[PDB]
Design an enzyme around this catalytic site. Structure first.
Site, PDB file in Angstrom:
ATOM      1  N   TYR B  28       0.826  -1.194   0.000  1.00  0.00           N
ATOM      2  CA  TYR B  28       0.000   0.000   0.000  1.00  0.00           C
ATOM      3  C   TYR B  28       0.861   1.245   0.000  1.00  0.00           C
ATOM      4  O   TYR B  28       1.981   1.251   0.510  1.00  0.00           O
ATOM      5  CB  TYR B  28      -0.937   0.038   1.211  1.00  0.00           C
ATOM      6  CG  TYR B  28      -0.258   0.389   2.505  1.00  0.00           C
ATOM      7  CD1 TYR B  28      -0.053   1.714   2.862  1.00  0.00           C
ATOM      8  CD2 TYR B  28       0.160  -0.598   3.383  1.00  0.00           C
ATOM      9  CE1 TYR B  28       0.557   2.046   4.035  1.00  0.00           C
ATOM     10  CE2 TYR B  28       0.769  -0.276   4.564  1.00  0.00           C
ATOM     11  CZ  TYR B  28       0.963   1.051   4.886  1.00  0.00           C
ATOM     12  OH  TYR B  28       1.589   1.394   6.061  1.00  0.00           O
ATOM     13  N   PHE B  38       2.181   9.840   2.504  1.00  0.00           N
ATOM     14  CA  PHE B  38       2.662   9.768   3.870  1.00  0.00           C
ATOM     15  C   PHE B  38       3.077   8.371   4.292  1.00  0.00           C
ATOM     16  O   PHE B  38       3.641   8.229   5.379  1.00  0.00           O
ATOM     17  CB  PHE B  38       1.631  10.334   4.872  1.00  0.00           C
ATOM     18  CG  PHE B  38       0.306   9.620   4.882  1.00  0.00           C
ATOM     19  CD1 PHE B  38       0.180   8.361   5.448  1.00  0.00           C
ATOM     20  CD2 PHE B  38      -0.814  10.224   4.349  1.00  0.00           C
ATOM     21  CE1 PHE B  38      -1.019   7.699   5.447  1.00  0.00           C
ATOM     22  CE2 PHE B  38      -2.015   9.567   4.336  1.00  0.00           C
ATOM     23  CZ  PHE B  38      -2.117   8.301   4.897  1.00  0.00           C
ATOM     24  N   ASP B  39       2.861   7.344   3.475  1.00  0.00           N
ATOM     25  CA  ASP B  39       3.435   6.066   3.869  1.00  0.00           C
ATOM     26  C   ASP B  39       3.333   5.057   2.744  1.00  0.00           C
ATOM     27  O   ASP B  39       2.415   5.108   1.927  1.00  0.00           O
ATOM     28  CB  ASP B  39       2.764   5.500   5.119  1.00  0.00           C
ATOM     29  CG  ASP B  39       3.611   4.431   5.790  1.00  0.00           C
ATOM     30  OD1 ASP B  39       4.792   4.716   6.092  1.00  0.00           O
ATOM     31  OD2 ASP B  39       3.104   3.308   6.006  1.00  0.00           O
ATOM     32  N   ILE B  58      -8.434   0.871  10.484  1.00  0.00           N
ATOM     33  CA  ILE B  58      -9.519   1.824  10.267  1.00  0.00           C
ATOM     34  C   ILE B  58     -10.614   1.174   9.419  1.00  0.00           C
ATOM     35  O   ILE B  58     -10.368   0.231   8.663  1.00  0.00           O
ATOM     36  CB  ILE B  58      -9.003   3.110   9.600  1.00  0.00           C
ATOM     37  CG1 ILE B  58      -8.430   2.808   8.216  1.00  0.00           C
ATOM     38  CG2 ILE B  58      -7.955   3.768  10.450  1.00  0.00           C
ATOM     39  CD1 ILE B  58      -7.774   3.991   7.575  1.00  0.00           C
ATOM     40  N   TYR B  84      -9.430   8.722  10.384  1.00  0.00           N
ATOM     41  CA  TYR B  84      -9.062   9.281  11.672  1.00  0.00           C
ATOM     42  C   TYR B  84      -9.999  10.388  12.104  1.00  0.00           C
ATOM     43  O   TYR B  84      -9.820  10.953  13.186  1.00  0.00           O
ATOM     44  CB  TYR B  84      -7.616   9.772  11.620  1.00  0.00           C
ATOM     45  CG  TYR B  84      -6.659   8.623  11.389  1.00  0.00           C
ATOM     46  CD1 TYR B  84      -6.349   8.206  10.103  1.00  0.00           C
ATOM     47  CD2 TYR B  84      -6.106   7.924  12.458  1.00  0.00           C
ATOM     48  CE1 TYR B  84      -5.504   7.149   9.885  1.00  0.00           C
ATOM     49  CE2 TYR B  84      -5.251   6.862  12.251  1.00  0.00           C
ATOM     50  CZ  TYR B  84      -4.952   6.480  10.964  1.00  0.00           C
ATOM     51  OH  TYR B  84      -4.110   5.418  10.748  1.00  0.00           O
ATOM     52  N   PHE B 101      -5.813   5.468  -0.669  1.00  0.00           N
ATOM     53  CA  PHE B 101      -4.825   4.399  -0.688  1.00  0.00           C
ATOM     54  C   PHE B 101      -4.750   3.735  -2.060  1.00  0.00           C
ATOM     55  O   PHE B 101      -5.758   3.551  -2.746  1.00  0.00           O
ATOM     56  CB  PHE B 101      -5.140   3.326   0.367  1.00  0.00           C
ATOM     57  CG  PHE B 101      -4.790   3.729   1.754  1.00  0.00           C
ATOM     58  CD1 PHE B 101      -5.711   4.367   2.554  1.00  0.00           C
ATOM     59  CD2 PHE B 101      -3.533   3.458   2.274  1.00  0.00           C
ATOM     60  CE1 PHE B 101      -5.396   4.729   3.832  1.00  0.00           C
ATOM     61  CE2 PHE B 101      -3.220   3.818   3.563  1.00  0.00           C
ATOM     62  CZ  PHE B 101      -4.160   4.459   4.331  1.00  0.00           C
TER      63      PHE B 101
END
Ligand SMILES: C=C1CCN2C(=O)COc3cccc(c3)[C@@H](CCc3ccc(OC)c(OC)c3)OC(=O)[C@@H]3CCCCN3C(=O)C(=O)C(C)(C)COC(=O)[C@H](C)NC(=O)[C@H]2C1
Ligand SMILES: C=C1CCN2C(=O)COc3cccc(c3)[C@@H](CCc3ccc(OC)c(OC)c3)OC(=O)[C@@H]3CCCCN3C(=O)C(=O)C(C)(C)COC(=O)[C@H](C)NC(=O)[C@H]2C1
Lengths: 60, 109, 60, 109
Positions: B28, B38-39, B58, B84, B101
């Site tokens: 991912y 961010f990741d 989540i 979030y 994502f």
């Protein structure tokens, strides 16, 4: 009658408490993470096992 | 708006879908709604694994991946109450953030 | 009239959410901590800086 | 019962009390109400520091230490709603746990 407002105002305290505590642990983890990314160049087997936990699920 | 929307990038087998109790093995990349990465699991050079039904992720992920079949690559658009939400993710994900994502379901363990 | 019960039932969801997330981060920190206590015998300067964060306040 | 009770083990100077905004420097051992040790700053071989008023600690500590003077050694008996309350502290501190601390106020930074 509508004592629920006391239940409501209690719960709001719990979330402000829980959120502070959650943020605090998370902040520690982030910092431990940067400690690692500041040595991410020491091919270290221990620091690498901590970056594994860092992105793992407590299941595994 | 929709809690999680799943859009195919490339199809999976169309047959093998996660069941609860199975471990999903995934690559991912996560982005904010304006596209800021961010990741990426590919970065830490290891697939990310989680068990469906165990509440480990989540809700956008639980409900999203559950609709992918093995081999599929999907775009997951998650709204804040499936991510979030209000709090956000300190310093990384703002409040009320929509998240996108790019997810690949590699196998089911 | 007493819609507060909807406010109440919403808040309870938030605390079950926040508590799960808090517990999860905490669990990660504990585990990182045992990783350290399983090498607490390597006089390692990096692992020692992580045990410092482990018991610090984000202030410092 | 009382949120935090503070009892002198040995007196401090009787004059210098923490103000909000000051950093308290402390040695401590924490026990469950039945006496099971679960932590000591002396072990990690470093005083524990925190800023009063910054909400950094459980309320038993904020309200407890604030009543000690420099050099004092106190026994802090904290009830659950001033500690970890219902949730407790996963696997370490049960729910509704009363906690006892042995605390020494070393200096104010
Ligand atoms: C420093 C650390 C502390 C926090 N951390 C981890 O804890 C390890 O990565 C995870 C493993 C399993 C689940 C979780 C995250 C959870 C996070 C905790 C949680 C659990 C359950 C929730 O409900 C039930 C919830 O809210 C209702 C929240 O994340 C998720 O489920 C989703 C979907 C799976 C892939 C990761 N995910 C994302 O969004 C992301 O890509 C990240 C990781 C946030 C982007 O990396 C960052 O932001 C910063 C740089 N590093 C971290 O944030 C890492 C390292
Ligand atoms: C693995 C880790 C994750 C959790 N961790 C830390 O985070 C570092 O130690 C702290 C530093 C500052 C504040 C905090 C704890 C907070 C904890 C977070 C928090 C912050 C604020 C709260 O309100 C506003 C709250 O609730 C309303 C909760 O702790 C406190 O304030 C009180 C008073 C100050 C001395 C420590 N304290 C205690 O009780 C204890 O002796 C411990 C540390 C719990 C006993 O060690 C353990 O249990 C296990 C083995 N290791 C930990 O638990 C350590 C290492």
């Amino acid at each position: 009658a509508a004592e629920l407002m006391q239940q409501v105002n209690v719960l709001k305290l719990t979330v402000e408490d829980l959120e502070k505590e959650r943020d605090f642990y998370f902040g520690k983890l982030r910092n431990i993470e940067l400690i690692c990314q500041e040595n991410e160049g020491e091919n270290d087997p221990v620091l690498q096992r901590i970056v594994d936990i860092l992105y793992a699920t407590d299941e595994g | 708006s929709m809690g999680v929307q799943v859009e195919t990038i490339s199809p999976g087998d169309g047959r093998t879908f996660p069941k609860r109790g199975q471990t999903c093995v995934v690559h991912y990349t996560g982005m904010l709604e304006d596209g800021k990465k961010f990741d990426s699991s590919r970065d830490r050079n290891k697939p990310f694994k989680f068990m469906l039904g165990k509440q480990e992720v989540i809700r956008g992920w639980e409900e999203g991946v559950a609709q992918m079949s093995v081999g599929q690559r999907a775009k997951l658009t998650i709204s804040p109450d499936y991510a979030y939400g209000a709090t956000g993710h300190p310093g990384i994900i703002p409040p009320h953030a929509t998240l996108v994502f790019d997810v690949e379901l590699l196998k089911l363990e």
